[PDB]
Symmetry: none
Subunit: 242 residues, 2 copies
């Protein structure tokens, strides 16, 4: 009897899949709104439930839980940085969906891998839930590193797309999104088809150090320094030299 | 009135979608083959052409173009870095397709934004061509092509350094095929950026303001790679991508 305590895409993802007890949000308006598309109820000043998904910001997850504290259920959350051991109680689990949530694009779930960890009653639950949406998952103490990897893989890339957007913007291209995507999408796919070490191309890849150097000045001129740039090049060589 | 130099995968492109007079190559056969499939002649000890697409490695465009010597013909290369101006002649231009050339994947032809930059009278020649192949493009001054290329690098190459960092830590955790996992994580962001503004695609902990993780994840990062240089930089920017929205 899946209970979700967050009103905002992700529970929407799970709802749409595992289509249910209650759906809570700090304002029934949104709670209702959702439980009227998949079916359930409402209120963060709700009834007594008993599995519960606390899909709210990390820094809250713990608190929000130790505040509803009712009816024998199985505590779970989607944070890949924190364990279930935060709840500090019976049947605790953690199901992390390595993906970024456009709720439409996440409808290609069968590709999503899950980071699972729990206890007696908990683990098997998220394993089944995990199994019910995609093919498999992974079990994690290494929570930190495992999650860091998801951030420097689905978060950090925006910092590049952003950087590229700024300079294109300044260059007159009014709507660069379409261009930036084409390139970034390519790299993504190419990162697959070719494992990382064989996926590289560009200036550094082939020498052309006069291009890397001249673009360092061009990087500095557009922004205020060359730190990130020098960092990515030092990285790229590490890649390139494989 | 198109003559091409360099039987590269990229010329087979403009040829195919533009059905020509003289296709030069170092090999007479190689030129003769594309002429057989499209229509032209050959040799770099050629006849005397007169527009000339010099589609060869960025490394020889100038030299080669100075070993072509022919009369009345606007010159154009497709270098993403180099400028038309490298030709130092009255009728020049530069057409750059942001795409990587499988030959037929180029059936994606409709969605190739072009980076043009040409002469006064050399510009409308390339401007006309992009309009055909795919009506998406934009002119850029010759004194800004280095900026332009820089951009492509950030969106093209740079991500790789991110794929590298993660694969490294997924393997530290003994993950089967990390690239898959990586591709999933990254493509979700790669595509989303098409249906929305770059800055509307950031979803992580910085976004939520979960500094508590941003901070520990940085010590975890230091622990794994020796420093926090790259980590600090992106985080600074992401916290910047997230505030822009606060408006
Ligand atoms: N974005 C990502 O990159 C991914 C995040 N996750 C995990 O998902 C969880 C949340 O992710 P995310 O999508 O950012 O969520 P959002 O920040 O969009 O979540 C909004 C939801 O959190 C609730 N909320 C906001 N502030 C508070 C508060 N002060 N107290 C209680 N509830 C609050 C909202 O309340 P209300 O409905 O009342 O408005 C709403 O239900 C985390 O555990 C995260 O680690 C998993 C995969 C990916
Ligand atoms: N590859 C891509 O995805 C893209 C390339 N471009 C631009 O297109 C141009 C060519 O790019 P690229 O794909 O590397 O090309 P290729 O290496 O595929 O080009 C091969 C062609 O270049 C000729 N060539 C190679 N070396 C020499 C030389 N030393 N002297 C004379 N001719 C030579 C070949 O000789 P021969 O004729 O004898 O067979 C052949 O015709 C560049 O200006 C590049 O910046 C732009 C966008 C994308």
């Amino acid at each position: 009897v899946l209970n979700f305590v967050g009103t905002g895409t992700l529970t929407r993802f799970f709802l749409e899949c595992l289509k249910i007890g209650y759906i809570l949000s700090r304002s029934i308006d949104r709670a209702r709104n959702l439980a009227e598309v998949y079916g359930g109820k409402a209120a963060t000043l709700e009834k007594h439930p008993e599995v519960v998904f606390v899909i709210v910001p990390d820094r809250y997850i713990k608190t929000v839980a130790n505040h509803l504290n009712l009816g024998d259920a199985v505590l779970v959350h989607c944070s890949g940085f924190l364990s279930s051991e935060i709840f500090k109680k019976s049947g605790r689990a953690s199901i992390h969906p390595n993906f970024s949530f456009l709720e439409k694009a996440l409808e290609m779930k069968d590709q999503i891998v899950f980071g699972l960890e729990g206890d007696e009653r908990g683990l098997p639950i998220v394993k089944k839930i995990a199994e019910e949406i995609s093919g498999k998952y992974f079990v994690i103490e290494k929570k930190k590193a495992y999650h860091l990897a998801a951030v420097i893989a689905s978060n950090f890339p925006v910092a590049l797309a952003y950087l590229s957007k700024r300079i294109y913007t300044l260059l007159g291209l009014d709507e660069p999104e379409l261009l930036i995507h084409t390139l970034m999408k390519g790299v993504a796919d190419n990162i697959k088809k070719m494992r990382v070490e064989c996926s590289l191309t560009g200036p550094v890849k082939r020498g052309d150090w006069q291009v890397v150097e001249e673009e360092r000045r061009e990087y500095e001129k557009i922004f205020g320094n060359t730190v990130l740039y020098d960092e990515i090049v030092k990285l790229l060589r590490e890649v390139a030299e494989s």
